[PDB]
């Protein structure tokens, strides 16, 4: 269903933008807690 | 062995596998990782 694609895809864009703007500090916080 | 019996048994299994068991593993994992230093 194209409806499912065009509904999920905005969430995917939001998640990937948050990931590529927070991922360095996210991996650092994951490392510091082992 | 009825459809309602099978649905109840699957509810037991999937309430364990969706809610109870992965929360138990996640709590145990994050409590072992982020320990309190005395």
């Amino acid at each position: 269903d194209w409806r499912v694609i065009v509904v999920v895809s905005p969430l995917l864009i939001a998640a990937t933008w948050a990931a590529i703007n927070i991922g360095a500090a996210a991996i650092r916080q994951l490392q510091d807690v082992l | 062995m009825t459809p309602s019996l099978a649905n109840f048994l699957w509810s037991l299994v999937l309430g364990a596998a969706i809610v109870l068991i992965p929360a138990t593993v996640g709590l145990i994992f994050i409590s072992q990782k982020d320990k309190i230093t005395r």
């Binding site: - | 649905n7 145990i28 072992q32 320990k35 309190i36």
Partner: protein
């Protein structure tokens, strides 16, 4: 370090949102209940259970939306998603009103988790658990109204719907069908709630108007620090004021605050006992002496008999729409009505 005690350490950390052992019951259940209510009032109809539109998707507003009660045909079926009605179909489950027992059950277990949270944090902080004892009132209300009232009735249909106008419907329904204003248990509830509101207002006004001059600013709020030892307001002046104004006054701070606890909690418990009675249609509907007289004497009218007539009119004009599963066909000539209206 045992794994239980390590988990106990992690659950009871001093963070922004306290979790605790009670949080494992509270947070998923409260989230499920709140998300179910928001989901139902945003997207889910009551068209097949009630013949009504009750979501924002259908054009209802914040007053007119509800997670409505399920269809009367199901009885007191718990209406699980995997249950024999819905049979795993989420869409069918939404349409048959399964969001109502979803919200009501998760809400009830979340309320349990919240009073457990009150107990847990009271134990950790080191205070007495009177907040949980006070919260017993709201849980008594929720259990009597949303659970034992429909359980005593024919189905979950006659439970209150989780909505503003749905609750107003439940309220008017209990007036017209049960004469719930006439019930003394509700009168004690009303007395408790209005007394709690009175005590709140009077206690706040008395403290704010018997404050000690403990600062140089006209803004009196900065003349307090939490770690101070002495009282921020004059109990002696407050006592003298209310003794000369009202006749009596509080002379004990602890008794004052226990009474502020006691009045609305007792009102809630009393109204809950009345709702338990109403679950079995054990109403204070009538004063039989006045009906026997009114049936014998057509000159006898009180405000009670007028209220009885109001209830009859409401029942006859509301029941075909409020209970569409019954297929109540009331032709216009049988509807009770006064002259010219």
């Amino acid at each position: 370090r045992g794994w239980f005690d390590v988990l106990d350490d992690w659950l009871k950390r001093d963070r922004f949102v306290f979790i605790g052992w009670s949080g494992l019951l509270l947070f998923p259940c409260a989230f499920m209940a709140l998300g179910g209510w928001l989901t139902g009032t945003t997207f889910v109809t009551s068209w097949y259970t009630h013949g009504l539109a009750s979501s924002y998707l259908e054009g209802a507003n914040f007053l007119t939306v509800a997670v409505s009660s399920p269809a009367d045909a199901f009885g007191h079926s718990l209406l699980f998603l995997w249950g024999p009605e819905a049979q795993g179909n989420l869409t069918r489950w939404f349409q048959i009103g399964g969001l109502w027992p979803f919200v009501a059950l998760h809400g009830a277990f979340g309320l349990i988790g919240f009073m457990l949270r009150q107990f847990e944090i009271s134990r950790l902080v080191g205070i007495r658990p009177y907040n949980a004892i006070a919260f017993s009132g709201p849980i008594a209300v929720f259990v009597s109204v949303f659970l034992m009232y429909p359980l005593g009735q024919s189905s979950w249909f006659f439970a209150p719907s989780f909505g503003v106008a749905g609750i107003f419907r439940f309220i008017l329904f209990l007036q017209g069908f049960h004469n719930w204003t006439l019930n003394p248990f509700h009168m004690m509830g009303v007395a408790g709630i209005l007394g709690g509101a009175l005590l709140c207002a009077i206690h706040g006004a008395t403290v704010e108007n018997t404050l000690f001059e403990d600062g140089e600013d006209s803004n009196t709020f900065r003349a307090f620090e939490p770690t101070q030892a002495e009282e921020t307001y004059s109990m002696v002046t407050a006592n003298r004021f209310w003794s000369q104004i009202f006749g009596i006054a509080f002379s004990n701070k602890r008794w004052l605050h226990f009474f502020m606890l006691f009045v609305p909690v007792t009102g809630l418990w009393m109204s809950s006992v009345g709702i338990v009675g109403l679950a079995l249609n054990l109403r204070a509907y009538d004063f039989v002496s006045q009906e026997l007289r009114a049936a014998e004497d057509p000159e006898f009218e009180t405000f009670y008999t007028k209220n009885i007539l109001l209830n009859e009119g409401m029942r006859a004009w509301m029941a075909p729409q409020d209970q569409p599963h019954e297929n109540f066909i009331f032709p216009e000539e049988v509807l009770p009505r006064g002259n010219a209206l």
